[PDB]
């Protein structure tokens, strides 16, 4: 998973 909730990972 991607732990950064303040950026779009996709």
């Amino acid at each position: 998973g991607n732990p950064d909730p303040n950026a779009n990972p996709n």
Partner: antibody
Amino acid sequence: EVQLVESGGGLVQPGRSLRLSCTASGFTFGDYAMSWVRQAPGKGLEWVGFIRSKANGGRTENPASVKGRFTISRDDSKSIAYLQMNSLKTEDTAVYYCTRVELGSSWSLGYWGQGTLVTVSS
Amino acid sequence: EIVLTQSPGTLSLSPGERATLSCRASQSVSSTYLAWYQQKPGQAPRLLIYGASSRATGIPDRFSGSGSGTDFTLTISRLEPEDFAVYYCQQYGSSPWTFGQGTKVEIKR
């Protein structure tokens, strides 16, 4: 004043589903990621997922330990975050907290609601 | 996952004394992604320190956080009656986000 009013908790049968609501006020709800954290009686804190802002894609992340049973969604027009919990087990009995994820490069959990107790039992 | 082990389990101290709380990570964590929370019984947690060392708003000067790598510390330099509580560390730099098991700072009488 930041308010994160959880509702929808209470008693639920093992195996059933329950949707929690977090009615937010006192801030620009649409700007923030929101996260749910739970605390089983007598135990510590466990993260059970977050959802990003619409500007950041609006997608969720959940811990593998929950085995895909939980879904987080948001309604920006009503400033409500949801936690949909399926296939509930007695181990899911806990106080469930709604939290606001802070903006910027250190995304800590800046604000926490009172939490709502979910009791999974027959 | 990154396991956070806190020590000690319970710290019994008198008001005015200094409390030192430890948080050990199973692998290294960037200090930007470590936070500390305070929780009292019947109450929700509240943020104390974020980014290992930055105080949240309204947190008095007697709270300070430090550390890097796998070892992080929360120091409460001169305990006031309202500082006695359980303290949790948290990392949010790796998925899943994880919390330590908590350290109880109880008032010694």
